[PDB]
Amino acid sequence: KNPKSDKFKVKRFHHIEFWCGDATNVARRFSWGLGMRFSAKSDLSTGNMVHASYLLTSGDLRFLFTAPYSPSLSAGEIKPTTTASIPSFDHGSCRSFFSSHGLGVRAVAIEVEDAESAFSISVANGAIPSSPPIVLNEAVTIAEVKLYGDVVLRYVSYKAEFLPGFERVEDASSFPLDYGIRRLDHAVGNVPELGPALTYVAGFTGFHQFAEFSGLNSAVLASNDEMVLLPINEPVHGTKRKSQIQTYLEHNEGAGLQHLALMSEDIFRTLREMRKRSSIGGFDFMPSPPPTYYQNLKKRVGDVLSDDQIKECEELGILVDRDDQGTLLQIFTKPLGDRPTIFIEIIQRVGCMMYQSGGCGGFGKGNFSELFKSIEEYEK
């Protein structure tokens, strides 16, 4: 059931913003590791004396990396005279965020019809304001409300190229990397208590529960067309293996964004290219499942994947799961930085053709029982 109860018109995910201490090094690492092109910049060379911001793109996926300069460069400025291109940015908030959480996501940004209306309706419905609507060059409106922890949900609306004040990067500095990643599929938060978090977010957005079918409890909030998907996890205490959600909260100093799932148009190519680079500056992946898991895949998905395509899943360590409506190919990176906090999922979905409907195949819940069972089978 989808009650289509969004309180304002939401389009798609627009970008993800990481707060960094050095945006250059993180952006360059991510570009090489994920196959994203340097697309736009806002920094000293564009007149921004406040923050350095670099945008990476792959298809429709937009990753923004921002770090603060010395406050001394802008000590004469006031908000009416700011040279910042993102008016919500604050030196103190950014340093506080990075020192507290380490490298991580500050903003989950969605495109909406009218960011000023989205902000007003959100706050009228319980959202905690973080940055009021600001109109940039009479062309784009940006506003922010608290999502969970120190992560904000950012609303962006366009009257009619990223943001005003950003410049397109020179072709000589912009290498056309592409490993097949095309868009953000979902963004997942970890919180201490799931119930109050869902009630809060569903309260101000009108997002509905998407619904599925040890360690954690989870639920997914979804927009009207189910293209904006926001899962939230809470820990389950008292187990034998300590909850990785609890480990996250401890190392992150509280709630925050746990993983970003990036859709690939060709997950085999994406993983071939990412694994080639794991030990030369890119990203590492979680350990691969035992061969008995792939032995059991023919029995579950052998009507969706050929034997050759399943052994190709085995070569790259890809996991497969299936809903009642579609099939899911997925795999997870090791944490993106020093702390065992944020990581990336690469995903491809097959089925649910109308365009493809959102969340086709689910989020992999069935792989939990399957891997425990595969662990027992490999031991035998």
Ligand X SMILES: Cn1[nH]c(-c2ccccc2)c(C(=O)c2ccc(N3CCCCC3)cc2[N+](=O)[O-])c1=O
Phi-psi domain of 361 (left: phi exceeds 0; alpha: psi -120 through 50; beta: other): left
Residues 72-91: x where in contact with its own copies by CB under 8 A, - otherwise, as a string:
xx------------------
Nearer to ligand X, 71 or 195 (CB): 195
- Please check if 138 is assigned to a binding site: no
The yes or no reply on residue 261 touching Co ion (CB under 5 A) is yes
Nearer to its own copies, 20 or 267 (CB): 20
Say which amino acid occupies 333: T
The yes or no reply on residue 246 touching ligand X (CB under 6 A) is no
* Least distance in angstroms from the C-beta of 281 to its own copies: 3
User: By CB under 6 A, how many residues form the interface with ligand X?
Assistant: 15
DSSP secondary structure, 9-46, as one string: -EEEEEEEEEE-S-HHHHHHHHHHHHT-EEEEEESGGG
The yes or no reply on residue 344 touching Co ion (CB under 5 A) is no
The yes or no reply on residue 326 touching ligand X (CB under 6 A) is no
The yes or no reply on residue 275 touching its own copies (CB under 8 A) is no
Could you tell which of its own copies, ligand X, Co ion, none binds residue 338, using a CB distance below 5 to 8 A set by kind?
A: its own copies
β-pair partners for 332? 345
Q: Could you say which of 82, 83, 93, 100 contacts its own copies (CB under 8 A)?
A: 100
- Please check if 186 is assigned to a binding site: yes
Q: Which stretch binds its own copies (CB under 8 A): 9-17, 66-74, 190-198, 311-319?
A: 66-74
CA distance 52 to 335: 24
Q: To which residue do tokens 């005003």 refer?
A: 164
Cα–chain-centroid distance for residue 337?
15
Nearer to ligand X, 27 or 271 (CB): 271
DSSP secondary structure, 58-113, as one string: ETTEEEEEEEE--GGGGTT--GGG---SSTT--HHHHHHHHHHH-SEEEEEEEEES
The yes or no reply on residue 365 touching ligand X (CB under 6 A) is yes
Which positions ≥6 away from 149 have C-beta within 8 Å?
101, 189, 191, 252, 254, 255, 256, 257
* Least distance in angstroms from the C-beta of 259 to its own copies: 17
Q: What would the two tokens of residue 341 be? A: 């906090």
Alpha-carbon Rg of the chain, whole angstroms? 21
The yes or no reply on residue 320 touching Co ion (CB under 5 A) is no
The yes or no reply on residue 121 touching its own copies (CB under 8 A) is no
CA distance 225 to 68: 37
CA distance 69 to 374: 50
* Least distance in angstroms from the C-beta of 188 to Co ion: 6
The yes or no reply on residue 106 touching ligand X (CB under 6 A) is no
Q: Could you say which of 35, 149, 180, 231 contacts ligand X (CB under 6 A)?
A: 231
- For helices 194-205 and 115-124, the axis angle rounded to 10 degrees is 130
List phi, psi (to 5°) of 30: -65, -40
- Please check if 111 is assigned to a binding site: no
**Would you list which residues are annotated within the binding site for Fe cation?**
186, 259, 345
User: Using CB under 6 A as the criterion, which residues of the chain lie in contact with ligand X when the complex forms?
Assistant: 186, 188, 218, 220, 231, 259, 319, 332, 345, 363-365, 367-368, 371
Sites of contact with its own copies (CB under 8 A)? 20-26, 28-33, 38, 43-44, 52, 67, 69-70, 72-73, 95, 98-100, 102-103, 172-175, 177, 250-253, 279-282, 284, 336-340
Binding region for Co ion (CB under 5 A): 261, 345, 363
